[PDB]
Amino acid sequence: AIRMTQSPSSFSASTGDRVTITCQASESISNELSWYQQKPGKAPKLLIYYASTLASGVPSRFSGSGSGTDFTLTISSLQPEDFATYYCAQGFGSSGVENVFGGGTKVEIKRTVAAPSVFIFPPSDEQLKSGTASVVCLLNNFYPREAKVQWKVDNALQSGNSQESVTEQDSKDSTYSLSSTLTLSKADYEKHKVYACEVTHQGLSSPVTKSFNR
Amino acid sequence: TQPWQAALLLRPNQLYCGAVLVHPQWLLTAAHCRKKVFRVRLQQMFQGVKSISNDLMLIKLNRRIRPTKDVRPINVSSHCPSAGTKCLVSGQCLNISVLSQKRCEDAYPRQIDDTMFCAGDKSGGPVVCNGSLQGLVSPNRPGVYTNLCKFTKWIQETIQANS
Amino acid sequence: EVQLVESGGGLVQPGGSLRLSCAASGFSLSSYGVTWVRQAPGKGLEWIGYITSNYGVSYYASWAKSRSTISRDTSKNTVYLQMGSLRAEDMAVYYCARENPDYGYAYDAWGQGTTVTVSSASTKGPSVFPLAPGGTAALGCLVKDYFPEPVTVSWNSGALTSGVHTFPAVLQSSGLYSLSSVVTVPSSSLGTQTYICNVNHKPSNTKVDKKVEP
């Protein structure tokens, strides 16, 4: 009945900082411990095995330590492409085990403030022939996460009609990007003419609006 | 050494199974040594008076032996052995090292579980690690041994009910 | 090359059965055991079990023993996972991975993952609409009305990689999903380089290629 636990669940540090994350076995497992990195949307990849030996191709800033019940994974200097979730796994025994993996530690990267490159995209003709209009505001390559986008058509506030969606920190500049989609009936799209998205990032002097009209 | 080692004999020098003196009137051995007729060689020559589970067997001796230097019991450890620990298997003594249980899982045709441990390098006999009994003897494959730490109570119980 | 190719993940209705294949190339199942691990959206790695290399003995997670079976066809060098009585809690990405005994059975080669959706709904393919364009120009594709997930978006058939952001899908009120995929390019290519978005919806075996141009 070996149980594995990781700590913390979430680890935020800044670029270049030293990162240390832990893993614990409910019973001794000697050095039969492995660490896996899982980048967003990808299979896990083996980083460390026998508690401390680096796998081929793993950057030397990674290292691992411990023997028995308490284990450590360490990133000597946090790089952007280290954004991932990290799992440990025991390979000591398989019987009476609920899970060989620990719960994982998500590493998040703190960077300098970056400014949202805002764009507006008007609906497609193909979509309008179907009877539904979709205007989309793109906020590219900014940081930190929160920032608000609000929609005003004919400078009237719209509500209960907007979907919003944000990526995860980019693997090389550690930024976010975001989509705001105003979806309307093509009737209401043609009735009105002014089309405006309200941005509110803590990187801008004051709200930038990108916008169009037919 | 090996003052705890004992031999189970069939009529009359048919040597067949080993056993380990765990208390001054008690032997431990493997289950497949369940003969309903045996004698004991510990030296002194005794008879079984009680035999017991499907993993190990306790044997109560007719006489309680006075702990000597040529005959003395060995304590059954409650600490399970950890991989890397070095032990000795006797019954002619060979040195062995506890391994991960997955080495035995990967190599054996049946399921391995907690009630065994995996060990190897270069029946009824003892596996002694830190000076205490930690296992019993169940090609170039690692050996599986009975993990006595998981049984420390079944023996205590079984002794109280036959004492 | 060591490679694990998975197959068999699709839309299964509740109470149905899943059968998954992990075809190993570049190594022999008599030398490497293979594990099955699953992952629900946004959650951790959940070990299901594994099958040893020599005699093909199966070990299971305690929660999985009553409903799961892991098996091996040594002639096809293929490992299988079978599961019955499927419920919502079984919706997941399912990976197989090879256990390397020299690394103390660490998981050193992973499959691509096959997605299992437990639903009673019907498969609907994606409708793709263009998001048509100082200094740098942004293009995109709105992918709507598809079920289930995932869709894979690429640009110019895997050529255009740098600068792409594909956003997380969002479940609409329809019970169908929507998302968008955007890219930034030099504005000097907008009237020269042809930009095509390629949407692959494997659950409906559908591929849509929409040219985006100004």
Side-chain angles (χ1 to χ4, degrees), chain A residues 34 36 38 42-44 46 49-50 87 89 91 94 97-101 119 121-122 124 126-127 134 136 138 140-141 163-167 170 177-179, chain C residues 37 39 43-47 50 59 61-63 95 101-104 106-108 110-111 129-132 138-139 142 165-168 172 180 182 184 210:
Chain A
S34 310
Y36 301 86
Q38 189 178 32
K42 290 187 63 236
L46 173 63
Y49 74 70
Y50 285 132
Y87 298 90
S94 302
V97 172
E98 173 87 340
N99 197 356
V100 85
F101 289 99
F119 302 83
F121 293 99
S124 87
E126 194 49 67
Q127 198 200 345
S134 275
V136 63
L138 191 273
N140 217 39
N141 288 9
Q163 280 313 20
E164 213 184 339
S165 147
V166 52
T167 58
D170 175 75
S177 299
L178 174 144
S179 99
Chain C
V37 173
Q39 198 173 27
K43 270 62 199 155
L45 293 169
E46 309 301 329
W47 182 69
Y50 91 105
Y59 290 84
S62 87
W63 60 267
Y95 304 97
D102 291 338
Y103 299 171
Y107 311 135
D108 67 338
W110 290 69
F129 305 115
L131 295 177
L139 321 163
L142 187 48
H165 296 278
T166 299
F167 291 85
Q172 302 299 131
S180 47
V182 305
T184 47
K210 193 94 178 213

Side-chain angles (χ1 to χ4, degrees), chain A residues 75-135:
Chain A
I75 306 174
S76 86
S77 164
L78 186 56
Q79 296 306 116
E81 64 265 20
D82 294 345
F83 182 83
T85 297
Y86 294 83
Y87 298 90
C88 67
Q90 63 93 3
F92 175 84
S94 302
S95 80
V97 172
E98 173 87 340
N99 197 356
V100 85
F101 289 99
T105 296
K106 178 183 177 182
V107 172
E108 297 128 288
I109 316 190
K110 218 92 191 200
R111 56 150 291 105
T112 189
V113 186
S117 314
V118 183
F119 302 83
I120 188 93
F121 293 99
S124 87
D125 279 332
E126 194 49 67
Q127 198 200 345
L128 280 173
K129 291 160 187 198
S130 78
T132 279
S134 275
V135 175

Side-chain angles (χ1 to χ4, degrees), chain A residues 192-209:
Chain A
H192 311 87
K193 183 178 179 180
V194 176
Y195 286 107
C197 54
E198 168 146 306
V199 67
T200 325
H201 187 52
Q202 39 163 105
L204 44 73
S205 291
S206 266
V208 172
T209 88

Side-chain angles (χ1 to χ4, degrees), chain A residues 181-194:
Chain A
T181 37
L182 241 184
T183 292
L184 324 161
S185 85
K186 94 152 171 33
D188 298 42
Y189 175 76
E190 294 291 351
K191 284 169 44 203
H192 311 87
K193 183 178 179 180
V194 176

Side-chain angles (χ1 to χ4, degrees), chain A residues 1-2 27-32 50 90-96, chain B residues 81-84 98-103 105 111-114 150:
Chain A
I2 309 122
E27 304 175 343
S28 170
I29 59 175
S30 177
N31 64 343
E32 284 126 25
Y50 285 132
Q90 63 93 3
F92 175 84
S94 302
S95 80
Chain B
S82 86
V98 182
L99 303 161
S100 96
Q101 306 236 353
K102 291 209 63 174
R103 304 278 171 207
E105 295 171 17
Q111 198 138 268
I112 308 286
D113 59 62
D114 266 4
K150 305 290 184 184

Side-chain angles (χ1 to χ4, degrees), chain B residues 2-74:
Chain B
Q2 313 322 83
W4 39 82
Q5 189 94 39
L8 279 63
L9 288 87
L10 237 48
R11 310 181 99 317
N13 157 40
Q14 302 325 102
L15 194 157
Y16 87 102
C17 264
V20 185
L21 195 68
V22 287
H23 290 287
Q25 207 182 339
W26 282 95
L27 293 179
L28 188 56
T29 190
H32 88 94
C33 300
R34 194 81 141 271
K35 293 334 279 162
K36 315 320 268 174
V37 278
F38 50 108
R39 260 66 53 90
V40 165
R41 263 198 218 208
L42 245 195
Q43 287 290 53
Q44 337 187 346
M45 318 313 216
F46 306 134
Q47 284 84 257
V49 153
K50 135 83 181 173
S51 301
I52 63 97
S53 149
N54 245 331
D55 283 302
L56 53 56
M57 173 179 359
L58 279 162
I59 295 169
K60 173 151 160 167
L61 299 161
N62 62 329
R63 293 181 53 199
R64 183 186 207 266
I65 312 95
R66 299 292 303 291
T68 312
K69 99 207 270 175
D70 294 5
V71 178
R72 50 192 191 193
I74 196 170

